[PDB]
Protein: 29-kDa galactose-binding lectin
Organism: Lumbricus terrestris
Amino acid sequence: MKPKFFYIKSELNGKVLDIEGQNPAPGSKIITWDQKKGPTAVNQLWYTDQQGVIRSKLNDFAIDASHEQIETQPFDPNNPKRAWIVSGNTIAQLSDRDIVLDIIKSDKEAGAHICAWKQHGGPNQKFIIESE
């Protein structure tokens, strides 16, 4: 039961998305940051579940768009926000294929928060994936 992880880094800023917490600690906010090299990179690596739900390599944890800002927490069957699917070069919500995470402010500034927005083809909505 050893799936595959990947690297999710914005195609605009070239930074890698990371979860503020690097642990099972639920409620951690997500943002963009510089890619790291070592045993502390899992925070920027994710994997896809058998059901099509991504979860950070750190452990069985999916992001949820319940609040204004995207956060990570334990998967919830009754929560249609804790199930994110990957579409090409973008992360899209399960119940909303027309919704996909994006970089707030569309700026290059690192450590910037993110949220799910209506796909508009904007450069700020472009991300790159790198399997391990």
About this structure: The chain has no helices and twelve strands. The longest strand covers residues 5-10. The two ends are 17 Å apart (CA to CA).
